């Protein structure tokens, strides 16, 4: 299964509203995970199956979707939530990531 | 607290092979999927493959040829062996546990990281 | 229609003012007469409950979601999630079976711990009353009829509640009035909340509610308490726990809640509660004049059940007896033991069965003694009598 | 005897009715008076509380029966008995040494649980009092002399409660009457129980009752809970248990309820509780007419206590003074810090204490300060000195 | 200054007495005027508390000494330490993980159990009021003016409460008068608890208070309660435990505390609780004279605030408004949804705002709906005008 | 929750000897009287012995001859073994326990029993 | 020890009160037990020390006597209640049973 | 509940050995200072020393050349042996625990003691 | 480290208020414990850490003083009293009992 995400770079500013999108080759059900990475640090869970979230991630992520199209989303952009987010499916193995989405500072 | 922490040779030459070993405290092996997984510099996040307590594995079919996950329980740690190495090897490795509960049916993916170790 | 004051309601002062004792009940209307003066209908509008302050909430359909476990072999130490520092998530420790068989290298008892997170789907709201904020509206008018200049005939409301009991306002010819009134409610609040459930509320006892064997939160918020009598975990095997939700509750809560007195919700403000019975006992004090009391016949005619004697939740009975050729008169009214003797041993919640003119549908409120009575309505041979048994 | 209404007890109107106001205690008469009419006696006759709704059950003397217990060596499971599924059997799940002196292939803690079946043999019960359906019955006759005809002078028994303040009776001469009245307890029931043990009954705190560590029930029935106050599991040997129950704790709630006050149960109804103090405030409205009032002397002459100044439970303080040669008059009575200034300290519940025919007995109820203070019946050189000390 | 009866206030009977009907505020004023007499000035002094019974005490800083450890090898038994049987003594039994490193003959679970003396620094305690005991204070006294021979002008204290509401004074041309009255709080004790911790003293919600997860204390004294809250039992290492004495809870109470009324303990007394709001309502009876009533213009000229509007805490909105040129005369206030229509939807706390003289300061209370509002004080262009939201 | 039940062959010839085992699942065999009896169809109820873990027995005296009971408590089974078969022993068996507390001192007889096997 | 039981068959029908006596050759106390057996299923366990009902049978069912003659009563009689009754002394070794009583339907 | 008690040779002949034994039960050995105390006949009491777990000992300066404090913890107990006995060591002698806690900083010095023997 | 103490022998009847006095040779900090041993029997700690009481001591005990001098105190002597004081340090080894202090009945 090859994942895709759109789009490979955003820029915002604090306040705004952001949505990502993450594509899958095949469905993959509600099996998907948004991991957010920040530079020299190993990656962390964000979502999981698609729309739960991970304890204690701040509620203004979201994440929606099914099957073979999936968005994340920040409703109100913070300083700390710059940087770069991968999806993941976990329907079969192997394990494939998304080549990623980075948010940076505008 | 469940950690996990990935150490062995930082400096490989070419051809050789490669011995990477996670090391797991705060909980036992016996459930879940330990995990591999890497990211060259500056490039995306790569699912090397994971092995449980089974014996049962799997592999990424671009490295499964070259690649070995070994799982020993005694002392709660698991190990990737990785050969014929090249210079597109040269990535942060990272161990992950992949989380799997067969009982009340939960599945959170790789829930816990090791910070990972620069292997050129 | 209104019932007229008797010679005996009412006093004239040589001088100062007049003064008028009422007792006033809901859906009942007291006038009161001059001569060559239009009447002056004074009633209880409403009784009310404005915003009682949330005491507890009591969760019966809970819902669990990310469930974790976390284990560790004999003589490892104490296994631990992040989760157990989390108020709303169900915890539990406990220690299950480990060895070869399991991923250990010896045999014994192994730490395991679980957590889920919590959420309350559906739960019963309890609610406090002020006693000294039980609000009241008096509502006064001179009695429309045909239309007299320079008289005002302006529906006075007045609002009152326990702490305010006096309260004033002007008529002509009456001139100026001060009422001074006080609330006796029909049930002790102070043994009761009132609770909420989906569209529904209620006046329950506290110490029924306090008793529940259900999780519950604080008036002032927090984590839910007790969450374990919706929260079950099964024995540990090997490294992992069954953790189950327990099923709804509603369907006990809502058994139990027959056995006890609805209030209705206002239907524009939507937050007020309108109590349905209790008294209202006023003094109210006009300038010196003079008015006219009404004598009262005591209904001998044969009278009829509109509504057969029926239990109204809070320990009395009501019945609605019509008056066809009686007239105006005062319905007699005694709950005696035997249909012989008749001595009274019952207590009239009603004041003055009144019937103003004929073909008139009364509401009468009584307490019988407990076990076996009769309620006699009227006397003669055409009296209304309807047995009756209280326990 | 009866006590006379005082000319400003009574208003009469120039046009409507007359008004009388009074304070009704019991055992005590107050009278109104009519020229060339018969006296109308008014009593307070009794103050009830009936069929309270019970909220709580204490238990303090248990009973097992039926001990069962269940043992399994180590690492074969947790060990079951049914009798685990019941709400009238104590149980407790723990762990015992096994190994192979009994019984087991290995030495380890193996699962052992015990069951016995919960009876409550003796229970304390307590009862919540609705204030909103506490009675009182006035009693109301002309009084009795040298017949007359045409008067009547049957007694009317006039029922009420804290709801139904308004009741009425008839009398000739006099006429239709309304009363309306209102009860003020002498002890504050919102945070009281009834309190039932075995043949005797008290009036208790409710956060005492409820702080208590012994097994309760809900007032809805059900299960006892926190059966562990009275059911004892000794530490575990081999495969057994033992089982014991608590002694009766009798003696502690006997010793702790000295400092409680008791209430009578009615002795021919058996099902009321008659409380003993309380004041009911009453207007009576009767059509204009004309009473007599009775102006009152202060007593000067000798009195003496026949009954000393003695606790009374609630807070208050009870005498008996007689009054020998003073004639009809009012006692004055004081409570200050010294013999000497007499400045009023304490609060006087008794109102008018009044003597009607010399050589008669009367109860006089007091509240003094907090500290030392002296209680002065009388004034001058005979005046009744009483010390007191209040905590 | 006082503020003169209005007719309608008082009613003189034809025979009898004239009765006075008035609701006394603090901090007010309410005369009885006389043609040739001095006026009769009645004032409500105070509503006090007087030695509350104690409820419950709260711990929020809890020290531990003593602390004591006993440990056992895996089956050797369980551990004891006498201090298991001290009720002052905060105690865990658990087991450690034993073995050959530790001087132990097997590896396993070793029995292991600490105790430590639990005394509580600071605590918070509560108290109860016995509705019945509320007291209050009524002071009565000819109108001081010029001297006058023969007329007595000695102050008069009545010392009244719930259950003593009859209380009886005399005055020269007035005569003997008998006062009954009653009280209306401004806040249920019924739900509340006076709490006192160090200094300063608040009333508090009960159940607020109930739910307080903080070691407890009957009040019949004893032991603490549920000591784990400030008790904290590390995870036992080989034969030892770490024991800790949580934090001070102050700064949680404290804060906690701000969002509750305050209540004055007295400054001589100190043992008096002293109540802010209030009514009280009274029925003097004083033998059949003449009174002079006094008439209120509704006042017309420029107002203004005083003090603005404000939160008094228990719901209710204090203002004071100043009244430079009116003269005396009543404030005209209500509270409307717009300044337009203005029709009255909140409640007048107050008893009749008078100004007796310009340039005097008025207090007005009043009870405004929730959600958004405007208190309007006066009529016509230069009415006061205070918008407002309560919730 | 404790269960017995018995197995063997339900077809034994006389002269023969007779096996039956019973099976104790939910609790050990450490205390109690473990227990035989048996019914021939239509006829009433035979008690015929017990045996304890210490090893105390008691048999019927009209069976007593032929009649062995045993114990094994490392897999908590207890055996009936009957010898010199006739047809007067063609019956139903039932294991059973005979509960026993000499720490409380309750005594509640079979309380448990098998749903037995029809020998002929 | 020898057990007899009175009467050997008894009929009765629903609601019907019935009293079944059980009789030891010598004193037993009150180490006796009363079994309700059903064809084809294996003995259960009513009675235990003459008057004490096991859990949870109903409490219809009643068990009096000691030392020599005891008596089993059933005050309404249920359909369930159709069945054979054995009696069972347990005071001293060899366990013995009664002979037993027949219940059935009229 | 932690009980000690000696026992041993009442009667002991000058320049012997003397060998005491204090036995504890309702604790374990691991934790404390194991000691022991001694008092002369109407005289005072002398500290004559401890042993702990580790095999850190302590003895009185009057009486180290003579004195040894052993400790077997496999069976809870520990031993006081005295040579060169005199007259002057005609005494009473107690075995006693020196509580000492070294997690939460609590030391009751000695809390327990023995009856204690008497030696002549 | 010596120890010493005063006096040697007290006389004081019921009720009587009393102090004894301990001194070390050098600083001991707040190392000191009181004992009470009564003839016969083995000596029973009393204080501990200079003025805490053991449990569970009668309140009527008290302990004072640190560095050098110590006092123990009996507001109110009872029967139960009367017998030897012993203090003993116990800041180093070897650890050192004074010679005590006798107190008897008058």
């Given at each position: ?40 640090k ?65 | ?15 050789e ?6 090391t ?97 | ?9 009412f ?26 003066k ?15 302050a ?12 990310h ?41 014994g ?120 009598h919706?929260?079950?975990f ?6 992992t726990?069954r ?55 005591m ?17 009395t ?75």
């Open positions: 299964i090859v994942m895709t995400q759109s789009p490979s770079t955003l820029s915002a500013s604090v306040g705004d509203r952001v949505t990502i999108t993450c594509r899958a080759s095949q469905s993959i059900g509600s099996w998907l995970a948004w991991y957010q990475q920040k530079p020299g190993a990656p962390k869970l964000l979502i999981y199956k698609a729309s739960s979230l991970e304890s204690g991630v701040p509620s203004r992520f979201s994440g929606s979707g099914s099957g073979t199209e999936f968005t994340l989303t920040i409703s109100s952009l913070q300083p700390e939530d710059f940087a770069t987010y991968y999806c993941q499916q976990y329907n079969n193995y192997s394990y494939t990531f998304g080549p990623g989405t980075k948010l940076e500072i505008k | 607290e469940v950690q996990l922490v990935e150490s062995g040779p930082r400096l490989v030459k070419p051809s092979t490669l011995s990477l070993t996670c797991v405290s705060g909980g036992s092996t016996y459930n879940h999927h330990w995990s591999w997984i890497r990211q060259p510099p500056g490039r995306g996040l790569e699912w090397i493959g994971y092995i449980s307590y089974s014996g049962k594995s799997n592999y990424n079919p671009s490295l499964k040829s070259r690649v070995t996950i070994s799982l020993e329980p005694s002392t709660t740690q698991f190990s990737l062996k990785l050969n014929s190495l090249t210079a597109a090897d040269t990535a942060v490795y990272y161990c992950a546990r992949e989380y799997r509960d067969d009982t009340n049916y939960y599945y959170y993916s790789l829930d816990v990281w090791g910070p990972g170790t620069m292997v050129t | 229609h209104c019932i007229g004051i008797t010679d005996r309601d006093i004239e002062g040589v001088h100062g003012g007049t003064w008028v004792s009422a007792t006033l009940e809901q859906d009942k209307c007291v006038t009161v007469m001059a001569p060559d239009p009447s002056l209908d004074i009633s209880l509008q409403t009784v009310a409950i404005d915003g009682p949330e005491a507890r909430k009591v969760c019966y359909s809970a819902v669990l979601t469930v974790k476990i976390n284990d560790k072999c004999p003589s490892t130490g104490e296994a631990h999630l992040a989760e157990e520092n989390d108020g709303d998530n169900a915890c539990k420790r406990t220690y299950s079976d480990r060895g070869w068989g399991n991923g250990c290298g010896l045999f008892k192994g730490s395991i711990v679980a957590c889920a997170k919590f959420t309350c789907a559906k739960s019963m709201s309890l609610f406090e009353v002020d006693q000294t904020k039980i609000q009241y509206v008096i509502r006064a008018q001179l009695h429309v009829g045909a239309k007299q200049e320079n008289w005002n005939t302006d529906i006075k409301t007045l609002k009152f509640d326990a702490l305010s009991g006096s309260q004033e306002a002007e008529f002509t010819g009456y001139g100026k009035a001060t009422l001074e009134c006080q609330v006796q409610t029909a049930v002790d609040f102070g043994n009761s909340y009132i609770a909420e459930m989906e569209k529904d509320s209620w006046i329950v006892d506290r110490q029924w509610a306090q008793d529940l064997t259900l999780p519950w939160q604080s008036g002032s918020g927090g984590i839910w308490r007790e969450m374990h919706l929260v079950e099964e024995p540990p095997h090997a490294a726990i953790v189950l939700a327990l099923g709804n509750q509603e369907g006990s809560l809502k058994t139990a809640l027959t056995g006890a007195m609805r209030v209705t919700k206002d239907e524009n403000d939507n937050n007020l509660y309108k109590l349905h019975g209790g008294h209202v006992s006023c003094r109210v004090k006009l300038s010196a004049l003079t008015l006219k009391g009404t004598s009262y016949k209904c001998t005619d044969k009278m009829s059940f509109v509504k057969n004697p029926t239990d109204t939740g809070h320990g009975v009501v019945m609605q007896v019509k008056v066809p050729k009686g007239a105006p008169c005062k319905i007699p009214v005694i709950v005696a033991d035997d249909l012989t003797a008749a001595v009274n041993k019952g207590i009239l919640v009603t004041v003055n069965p009144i019937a103003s003119t004929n073909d008139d549908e009364v509401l009468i409120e009584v307490n019988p003694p407990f076990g076996d009575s009769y309620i006699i309505v009227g006397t003669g041979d055409s009296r209304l009598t309807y047995q009756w048994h209280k326990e």
